[PDB]
Amino acid sequence: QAPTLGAAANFALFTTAGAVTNTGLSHITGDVGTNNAASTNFGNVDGVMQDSNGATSAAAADLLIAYNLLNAAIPTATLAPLLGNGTTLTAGNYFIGQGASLSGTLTLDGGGNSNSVFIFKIQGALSSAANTQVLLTNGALACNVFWKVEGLVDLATNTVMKGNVVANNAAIVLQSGVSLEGRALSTTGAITVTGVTVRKPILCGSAVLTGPVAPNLGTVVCYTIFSGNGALTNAGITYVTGDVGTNVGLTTGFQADNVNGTIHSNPDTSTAQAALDLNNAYTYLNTLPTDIELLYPAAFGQNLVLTPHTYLLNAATVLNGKVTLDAQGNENAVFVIKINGALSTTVNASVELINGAIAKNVFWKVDGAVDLNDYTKFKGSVIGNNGAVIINTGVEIEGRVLSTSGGISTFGINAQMTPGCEL
């Protein structure tokens, strides 16, 4: 059996004792923390910032247990300290009785068995040369790779690294552009990262993320652009699949032959029922418990990747460029993004879906105005509350844009509802 990390598994970056510091734009999936200080200068992290609390205390204890199992592992072979340079290794417990250095390419080959475990016992420091790459093949999984390092871990610029890097009574330093599918864990010592990507490995018994239970949209699943209260006005050449309308005021500017659906030119029984159902959905989304707070709403996007959870952005939010929603292979995964303020975007902003994520299962609860800037590619169901909506030239929506209250103005857009309507 590979060693369990217990609570330490929750983390991308963790030290039992010391400072945890970021510089520049880093992309992190997993908790970040220290059991005796507070991490500084991180941007948006897909994980909880855990500082000197019950979570870090638990991680500290389980990291110790993990370390001891690593230290107890009976070596299957000895390696020279120069690791990589085109070398391939199969499963084993590898003993290096001095400081080690990674260089060039190192391939870990699973032999067609995803249960293959690779443990490196480094009796000294571990360094890499710039542009070093650790590669996995033939079934090998990052969650089954471990480095037990008795000294400073220092990974050079653009190092591609795999596995759980456990530094015992030493610091970890991850230089510009390091990309780690794995974890940086210290039993005490500082962690310093600069412009890195670190994503905790999935599998090896990690719970499959589902996200929260999706709201029931009721009849508003059949609408694509809808206001509970306020004029709905389109200009330019716009195409819609699904219904459009307002429950208070007039809908104008949509050309019937461009709408695969019904334009409700003024309020009717359908808009009345949609308005009730929109309020119910908003209230449901608003009251879902927050899993992860994204601490920098002004900096949202910039190639942030999210996983199935309920997120809170606790201020007006700007989507700059791209945000990606990663279902991690679970097509039924739900993402809820609660925004406590207005939502606006840059031109060419985008929401992208990977690893099975579908727009039907993405929801945005926006407590304020919604403004989708020119040529934004937006996905999911946006439910705004008390604020005007503007959807600018060329915006593409796979999903819907709804407001409980507020006028809506659209300009030359293409908006197509996601599945659920049965009319």
Numbering used by the authors: 23 to 445
Task: Please quote the paper that reports this structure.
Each domain contains a six-loop right-handed β-helix (solenoid) with a triangular cross section, and an α-helix, which runs parallel on one side of the β-helix. Site-directed mutagenesis confirmed that the proposed ice binding site for each domain is located at the same region on the β-helix for IBPv. Each domain of IBPv has two rows of water molecules on the IBS that form hydrogen bonds with the protein backbone, and more water molecules are found in the IBS of domain B compared to domain A. In the crystal structure of IBPv, a layer of ordered water molecules forms a water network that consists of several pentagonal and hexagonal ring on the IBS of domain B. However, no such water network is observed on the IBS of domain A, which is the weaker one in ice binding activity of the two domains, suggesting that the presence of water network is correlated with the ice binding activity and thus supporting the anchored clathrate water binding mechanism.
Antifreeze proteins (AFPs) are a class of IBPs that have been documented in a number of cold-tolerant fish, insect, bacterial, fungal, and plant species, and this phenotype permits them to prevent and/or control ice crystal formation. Based on the recombinant IBPv exhibiting TH of 2.2°C at a concentration of 53μM, it is categorized as a hyperactive AFP. According to primary sequence, IBPv was predicted to consist of two separate ice binding domains.
